[PDB]
């Protein structure tokens, strides 16, 4: 054995912080509905992680990377371990949930809730017990890629570092398989479950406000990142200031480090805001919300990731790589994933044409503007809120606003079927089998742009493996182009980079270069602001599509230049 038994505490750890992450960004909506939190400070909560690993994944990848690095990063378990069970803390102390607990629209003829959570806040609040222990997950996480991997890669065999890392990057994979299935087989119990008897809680996940067992969850997290650092306090060392900034200007003047982690930058940028906004963006396009973007492409996206990463540690090591070849072998990968996002803008389909959005009410003549669009002579008679959003599709094909707008006076309502009837709008021709009938929901879209969705969905899988088969190429070449005795403040300083400007600020930039393409913002009580209805389907797929090819390609334009003035140097 050996350092394999290091390379299991490690993969448990791995398994451990991975789980945490995931089991933490699936109970967002719980605990805000339990919390009298504004989704203001809910981001705040959910930034906490980001707030915490940032100010500590330097300062404990450099002084660690001397003082025995299992003690390290089993302390940094133990930390994540309580910070995920005084994140649960909170349930046992509050009191019950017994805060617990139509619009058909056809046409004829202030602050409450912050108000009463500032009330709850008024001192406070319980939500800051989550915020913090949140916040000790990250000052725990740290010590476990910056302080793990250099180990491995300063310990191991020649040429064996690298399966090992494919090995570790694929067993995390493990995380979010027990996360999922263990969040929706506990977000099914009730929030005080074993407290209340379950057979008066009248909300259900159907209805509204129902809050589920979630102090189970984190607990679990808590207990299984505590049984994963317990292992850590038993191996060995070595298994046989005014230097800070003096090692960080040493690692900084380094041309070729500082390039490859604006390129990694760059990259790992573009691919988290894709696969941030890639749902929206199939269901924009399209038109398959979860037909397909369901859990099946979960249980046959992650072995294919896990895949691809351990075929990515196989390949560098079974064909001996020099650093030049692996340099080469992330550039190949970045060329594959380039030309698959080049191949998508192959796949388009037409744009949602609704009334009043781009055309009249009537469907005759198509409008420049959505804004400031004149009533027809269907409802003008008709008084209908034009700010609500109720997506109803007709037989001629076009999707209406609201079934008010529909031209509408009736609804089958309290009766199953959804169908409307009598409606102006639709009376498009004459003597066409003009029984005007409309269906609740948006126009599913022709079987043309179904079977391009099919397309879609294959060439993502394949793009993501191609681009999981490089996800262990990044680590290896900045531990073989940085100094010797710097491979963990090397590590760390570029997962501060990776995280704190690709993780925090990639969505954000998306979101608004997005948003720039809505044509319908749901306007507020409080404000005309609120969220997106629609986006044009042709500009919102330009828009992103084409922000992360140019990204890809600036990436790709880096990863040239750094492979020629590494076989210039070497
Ligand atoms: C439909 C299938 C499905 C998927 C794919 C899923 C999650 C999922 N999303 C991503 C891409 C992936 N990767 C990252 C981030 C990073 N990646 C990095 O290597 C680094 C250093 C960062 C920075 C923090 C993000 C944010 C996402 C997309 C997350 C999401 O929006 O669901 C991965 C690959 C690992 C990863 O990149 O973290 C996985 C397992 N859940 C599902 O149900
Ligand atoms: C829907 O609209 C039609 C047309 O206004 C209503 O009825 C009639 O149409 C047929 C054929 O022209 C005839 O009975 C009369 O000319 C119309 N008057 C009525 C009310 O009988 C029909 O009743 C409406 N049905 C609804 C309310 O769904
Ligand atoms: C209208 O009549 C046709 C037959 O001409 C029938 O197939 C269709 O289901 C009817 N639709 C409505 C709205 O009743």
Redesign the pocket.
């Given at each position: 054995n050996g350092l394999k038994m290091f390379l299991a505490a490690l993969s448990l750890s791995f398994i451990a912080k991975t789980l945490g992450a995931i089991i933490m960004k699936s109970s967002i909506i719980h605990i805000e509905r339990r919390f009298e939190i504004s989704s203001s400070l809910v981001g705040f909560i959910d930034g906490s992680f980001e707030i915490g690993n940032l100010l500590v994944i330097v300062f404990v990848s450099y002084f660690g990377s001397k003082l025995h690095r299992p003690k390290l990063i089993g302390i940094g378990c133990f930390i994540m371990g309580i910070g995920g069970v005084l994140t649960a803390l909170p349930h046992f102390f509050m009191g019950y949930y017994r805060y617990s607990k139509s619009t058909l629209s056809t046409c004829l003829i202030s602050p409450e809730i912050v108000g009463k959570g500032c009330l709850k806040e008024s001192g406070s609040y319980m939500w800051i017990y989550v915020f913090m222990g949140n916040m000790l997950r990250g000052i725990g996480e740290t010590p476990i890629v910056p302080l793990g991997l250099s180990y491995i890669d300063d310990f191991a065999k020649e040429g064996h570092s690298s399966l090992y890392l494919g090995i570790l990057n694929a067993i995390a994979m493990i995380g979010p398989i027990i996360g999922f299935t263990l969040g929706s087989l506990f977000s099914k119990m009730y929030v005080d479950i074993g407290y209340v008897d379950l057979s008066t809680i009248r909300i259900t996940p159907t209805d509204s406000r129902w809050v589920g067992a979630w102090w189970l969850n984190f607990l679990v997290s808590g207990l299984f990142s505590i049984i994963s650092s317990i292992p850590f306090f038993f191996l060995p060392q070595t298994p046989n200031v005014t230097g800070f900034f003096q090692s960080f200007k040493s690692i900084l003047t380094n041309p070729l480090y500082v390039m490859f982690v604006l390129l990694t930058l760059l990259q790992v940028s573009s691919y988290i805001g894709a696969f941030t906004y890639v749902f929206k963006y199939v269901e924009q396009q399209y038109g398959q919300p979860s037909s397909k973007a369901n859990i099946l492409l979960g249980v046959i996206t992650i072995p294919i990731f896990a895949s691809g990463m351990f075929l990515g540690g196989y390949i560098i090591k079974k064909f001996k790589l020099n650093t030049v070849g692996i340099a080469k072998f992330s550039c190949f990968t970045a060329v594959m994933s380039l030309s698959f996002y080049l191949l998508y803008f192959f796949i388009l389909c037409e744009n949602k044409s609704v009334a009043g959005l781009t055309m009249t009410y009537d469907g005759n003549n198509p409008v420049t503007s959505h804004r400031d669009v004149p009533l027809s002579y269907c409802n003008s008679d008709c008084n209908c809120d034009e700010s609500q959003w109720e997506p109803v599709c007709g037989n001629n094909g076009i999707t209406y606003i609201s079934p008010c707008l529909a031209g509408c006076?009736?609804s089958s309502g309290n009766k199953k079927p959804i169908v409307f009837?009598?409606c102006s709008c639709l009376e498009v021709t004459g003597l066409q089998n003009r029984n005007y009938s409309a269906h609740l929901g948006e126009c599913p879209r022709d079987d043309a742009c179904t079977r391009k969705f099919y397309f879609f969905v294959a060439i993502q899988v394949l793009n993501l493996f191609f681009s999981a088969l490089g996800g262990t190429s990044h680590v290896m070449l900045i531990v073989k182009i940085v100094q010797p005795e710097l491979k963990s403040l090397a590590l760390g300083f570029h997962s501060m980079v990776i995280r704190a400007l690709g993780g925090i600020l990639a969505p954000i930039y998306f979101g608004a270069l997005i948003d720039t393409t809505c044509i319908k913002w749901s306007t507020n009580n409080c404000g005309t602001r609120g969220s997106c209805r629609t986006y044009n389907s042709t500009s919102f797929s330009r828009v992103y599509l084409g922000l992360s090819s140019m990204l890809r390609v600036s990436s790709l334009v880096l990863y040239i230049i750094l492979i020629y003035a590494m076989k210039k140097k070497y």
């Open positions: 006076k009736s009837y009598n």
